[PDB]
Write a structure and sequence with these properties.
Strand content of chain A: 15-25%
Strand order of the largest sheet of chain A: 3-2-1-4-5-6-12-13-14
Number of domains of chain A: 2
CATH class of the largest domain in chain A: Alpha Beta
CATH architecture of the largest domain in chain A: Alpha-Beta Complex
Bound molecules: 1,4-dihydronicotinamide adenine dinucleotide, alpha-D-glucopyranose
Largest sheet of chain A: 9 strands, mixed
Keywords (chain B): NAD, Nucleotide-binding, Oxidoreductase
Helix content of chain A: 40-55%
GO molecular function (chain B): L-lactate dehydrogenase (NAD+) activity; nucleotide binding
Distance between the termini of chain A: 46 Å
Pfam family, one (chain B): Ldh_1_N
Structural class of chain A: alpha/beta
Largest interface: A-B, 52 and 53 residues
Family (chain B): Belongs to the LDH/MDH superfamily.
Protein name (chain B): L-lactate dehydrogenase
Oligomer: homodimer
């Protein structure tokens, strides 16, 4: 137990790499709560925590960030945000080349949650997002409404930024959603884009944006993650992903009831049967408080089935792995 | 050029500290940002991520990435983190001075009215190189280190006394290095001298001496724990708060490396000293009434500045050219 007892929320970051550090920085700056940076790399999270305790002093608050290499640091966590995983193959892009490895990490993490903080609200980030969140849930056995995956907020923010830059309006007033799988089949819902509730079609008809811009933004949204990977040279995005996850955690901690496209457990909704998918939901002090079911048209249902199939395809790969079908002995 | 009403902040160097400061500009809505670096592509990747971040937090702050010094055009503030870094590696200083003079030349050409903050050590050497090539007023350029060191001192006193860091005043002056001087006599708790807390038994002199040493050892402690790299969160935020004080004419007091013309018995060199940063740059340099022991300790930093200037001149004059 690292969290010294006090009034503040206790935020446990399982994974202290690029995104974990970003999120700890945000907690310090926002005075959101005390933080533990947990990692398997020895001492590295203690170095970042020390830097971030200094940062709190820079901005005149006493938020404490702890570093830990022990799962027992999860004791009394109110929120757990997971970025744990192996993210590069030794010797040398897809959100799936390391699934066999990271599925096992997700199950150690889930078991740690079950043991040390079974009542926490859990946000997963580790890719492939929609099946990794399920792996955590099964190992942790937390209620379905107390766990989700961060992806839609990030994908939606990229759609919204591009519309905003095109129209010269604040992103504050661009409503936009990307649903489905956090992957190649992600579905930017171009029909549901609004400018302060005004359908984007009205702006199309006025000549403020044209159908070519719309089509390019649809494509660029799906490509944004890979575009960032290519430019960075090493690793993937971490600023916008960390802030997206932290806003979701803040909505839970302060009962804001804000709406986030998040990977949620569905049984019935969206033609999804007992697995996760990026859909609009409401996050408040009771966890996932509402799942909103859009009135998608036939074309959109067709596109969304591409996302659902991508998730199902991944479930079967995981079934095969767990069943031992993909390996054999020397003999 | 890459840059309206918003302030424009140029970040020369797009490593972790540079990205941290760009992130702060997005979160605080402080101004539009350009991440400059000599590496291709990487600053554009970070800028793309940060443009998405602005939208995550519902604002339109724009971060650009560039490999051309022309991106400094119309910058209101320039924060420099460029340079090559690692016994003694003074052999790297000539190339870093070359880099600094390239930046200063770009400043002279593209944003001569900017307020300039340098983070790359040794600050007296590197700040001067920029200033001389840029030909900017001495009150419009400084180095960041004192704010970082002081924030570390303040944090440790705060943790010991169980009071908010908001209410711990503390300063670390001199040269950022093994001769930095935490002024333990000037520590106050909302203006109350720390000695009153010593006499009352709330903190003892063993605690004080330990904190004096830990403040000097903090940067290396972090390096040792990280394995890779060094601190960048508190350093980045320290620099941005100095830039914000200039941009909003806040007149906040920071220990910064300022050009001295006789204060602290220093002439024509930069040293970490308390100063006031406002809309006119370095508006005031505060001269502390240091006692005898403190001036003696401060002399270690002053000797370090002067010894380093001599060594640099020796290396340059030894070049076959
Ligand atoms: N929309 C989304 O969901 C997005 C997801 N991501 C994903 O987030 C994940 C993390 O990204 P980064 O932070 O950049 O990677 P990173 O490699 O910087 O950090 C991952 C950390 O997890 C640690 N780790 C490994 N096993 C662990 C365990 N059992 N417990 C705790 N920590 C453990 C590693 O030591 C490493 O420090 C990746 O899978 C990445 O693909 C990235 C961007 C967006
Ligand atoms: O991007 C071009 C088109 O692609 C998809 O089919 C979307 O449903 C449509 O709204 C979009 O305009
Ligand atoms: O500033 C003078 C300092 O000298 C030494 O470091 C002592 O440990 C410290 O207590 C004293 O204040």
């Amino acid at each position: 137990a690292v969290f010294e007892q006090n009034k503040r929320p206790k935020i446990a970051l399982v994974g202290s790499g690029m995104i974990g550090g970003t999120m700890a920085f945000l907690c310090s700056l926002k005075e959101l709560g005390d933080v533990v940076l947990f990692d398997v790399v020895p001492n590295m999270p203690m170095g970042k925590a020390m830097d971030l305790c200094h940062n709190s002093s820079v901005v005149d608050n006493g938020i404490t960030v702890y570093g830990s290499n022990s799962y027992e640091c999860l004791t009394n966590a109110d929120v757990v945000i997971i970025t744990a995983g192996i993210t590069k193959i030794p010797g040398k892009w897809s959100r799936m080349d390391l699934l066999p490895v990271n599925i096992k990490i997700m199950r150690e993490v889930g078991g740690a949650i079950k043991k040390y903080c079974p009542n926490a609200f859990i946000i997963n980030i580790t890719n492939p997002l929609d099946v990794m969140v399920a792996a955590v849930q099964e190992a942790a056995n937390v209620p379905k409404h107390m766990i989700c995956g961060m992806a839609g907020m990030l994908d939606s923010s990229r759609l919204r930024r591009m519309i905003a830059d095109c129209l010269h309006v604040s992103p504050h007033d661009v409503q936009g959603m990307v649903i489905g799988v956090h992957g190649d089949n992600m579905l930017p819902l171009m029909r549901y884009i609004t400018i302060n509730g005004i359908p984007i079609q009205e702006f199309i008809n006025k000549g403020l944006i044209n159908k070519e811009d719309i089509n390019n933004i649809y494509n660029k949204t799906k490509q944004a993650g890979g575009d960032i990977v290519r430019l960075l040279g090493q690793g993937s995005a971490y600023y916008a992903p960390g802030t997206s996850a932290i806003l979701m955690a803040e909505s839970y901690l302060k009962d804001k009831k804000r709406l986030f496209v998040s990977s949620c457990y569905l049984n019935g909704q969206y033609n999804v049967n007992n697995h996760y998918l990026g859909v609009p939901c409401i996050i408040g002090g009771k966890g996932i408080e509402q799942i909103i079911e859009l009135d998608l048209n036939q074309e959109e249902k067709k596109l969304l089935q591409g996302s659902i199939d991508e998730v199902l395809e991944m479930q079967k790969a995981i079934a095969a792995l767990d069943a031992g079908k993909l390996e054999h002995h020397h003999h």
